[PDB]
Amino acid sequence: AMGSPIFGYSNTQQSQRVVTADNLMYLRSGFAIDAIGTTVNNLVGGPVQGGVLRAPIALDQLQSVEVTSGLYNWGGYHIVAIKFTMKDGSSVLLGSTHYASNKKVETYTVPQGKRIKQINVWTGGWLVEGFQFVY
């Protein structure tokens, strides 16, 4: 009712970012998810120097998410891919499903009438291990 569940894992360090009036979610990704934020300057995760910045997600138009996490081929357990499906049916896939094993796929629909106001991000300083929407 008050937020999404925690996708992925929650054993690393949680930071919190406020969604702006643009209602945008920014990510750095490559073979996995490196960082998550709400501006190009406040991303939480690995260092800018670690993946590369992608186009942001319009949270006001986000319908559902499909989050792939598992044993990363280069070590540990992290979120390796997120697929964002928008209200109009189009989707975008950031990260990759192909460089991890023992994989879990989490699906969740953004409830009707909710605005995503904060994003919680769990990161160990290298990759993203979990994230959560707050309404």
Author numbering: 820 to 868, 872 to 957
Can you provide the manuscript's text about this entry?
β-prism folds in V. cholerae are not unique to VCC: three additional β-prism domains exist in two biofilm matrix proteins called RbmC (rugosity and biofilm structure modulator C) and Bap1 (biofilm associated protein 1). RbmC and Bap1 are related multidomain proteins with overlapping functions, involved in the surface attachment of biofilms and encapsulation of growing cell clusters. For simplicity, we refer to the two β-prism domains of RbmC as RbmC1 and RbmC2. Our results illustrate a common structural mechanism by which vibrio toxin and biofilm β-prism domains target glycans on host cell-surfaces, facilitating cell lysis in one case and cell attachment in another.
